[PDB]
Each structure stands twice: as C-alpha cells, then as structure tokens.
Ligand SMILES: *SCCS(=O)(=O)O
C-alpha cells in the first residue's frame with residue numbers, strides 16, 4: 001500500500017526497527033551494532049525500503065515522521081533514534097542497553 005502504511009505497520013512499541021537500503025555502509029554498521037545485542041528474536045527488524053520499488057515515497061514519509069529522509073532510520077519502539085551516529089552515541093554511553101531493558105526487548 002502507501003508509504004505511510006509500509007512504515008507505520010513496522011514501527012511498534014517494544015520493537016527495534018531500522019529502515020535500510022542496499023549499498024549503504026552506515027546501514028550495515030547500524031545492523032552490526034544491533035545484531036551484537038541479545039535482543040529477542042522477532043524484536044529486531046531491518047526493513048529494506050527499496051524492495052517494493054517505492055524508495056522515494058518511503059523516504060518522503062520518513063522525513064515527515066522523523067525530520068530526516070536518510071537511512072538508516074533507527075526506531076526503538078516509536079522513538080526515532082535517528083541515524084547511525086545517533087545509534088553509536090547511545091551504544092557507547094550505555095543508554096542503548098538501558099532503553100532496551102526498559103522496553104523489555106532483551107531475549
Ligand atoms: S499494518 C500491518 C499490515 S500486515 O503486515 O499484517 O499485512
């Protein structure tokens with residue numbers, strides 16, 4: 001369906017969702033950071049925004065929803081973390097782990 005549906009359907013409280021595209025070094029780094037962690041299977045999802053041939057529309061909606069159109073676009077539940085640098089900052093400070101504990105996402 002619509003870009004809004006594609007995105008909103010995926011974002012869920014308690015779940016880590018990262019919108020990505022192919023050929024995206026920062027997407028791969030975001031994936032590495034999050035895949036290291038003991039997040040429960042099913043509560044981490046990487047979403048290829050190009051797979052339905054509506055890349056631009058999806059980025060347009062991400063821009064509307066979050067203020068930026070770029071991937072990776074990282075969500076912890078409904079919270080938009082932002083991009084890769086944002087995620088790195090949280091990982092390093094320990095805030096990523098604390099947030100995952102609070103929302104019950106660990107295995
Ligand atoms: S909003 C979720 C739609 S679906 O994935 O069940 O098809």
Ligand SMILES: *SCCS(=O)(=O)O
Pocket residue numbers: 026029030084085088
């Ligand atoms: S994670 C994106 C690369 S960097 O800004 O953290 O150097």
